[PDB]
């Protein structure tokens, strides 16, 4: 029981575009969360073996992390801003599913999610 391959970060059959919303997602949303004191546990895929998380990939079938989101934004993988927002939502939700209220990682995820919500509220129209 080890880790799956990380999520894809490049799709060569998918066209690429730069938009004002995608710029905001990289330059404000991802950058702010990535640089936060609590970001390190979320900067790469969950390594259930190194972290001793039994049954992680029996419980979480749609893993996501900020390292994947950063690479997707840097590679212009996202065509729609909603794809990126959905990945951040999946990352936080998985943490809440696997862990318990009051756990250190959940309190860290909640602080990052509050900051995510504050920044996404100012996504340009
Ligand atoms: C995402 C996601 N979803 N569930 C989990 C469950 C655990 C983790 C996790 C926790 C970590 O540290 C703990 C908060 C303390 C124990 N050791 C310390 O140094 C502090 C990590 C420290 C360095 C790198 N990666 C970590 C990943 C992330 N998780």
Author numbering: 42 to 166
Tell me what the authors wrote about this structure, in their words:
The binding domain 1 of the bromodomain‐containing protein 4 (Brd4‐BD1) that recognizes acetylated lysine residues, was chosen as model system, due to the availability of a large set of in‐house protein–ligand co‐crystal structures. Brd4‐BD1 contains three tryptophans, yielding a total of nine signals. In the following, we show that, in the case of Brd4‐BD1 ligand complexes, the CH‐groups of Trp81 are sensitive reporters for favorable CH–π contacts and can be easily monitored with 2D 1H‐13C HSQC NMR experiments. In order to provide a comprehensive assessment, we selected a set of 13 ligands for which both crystal structures and affinity data were available.
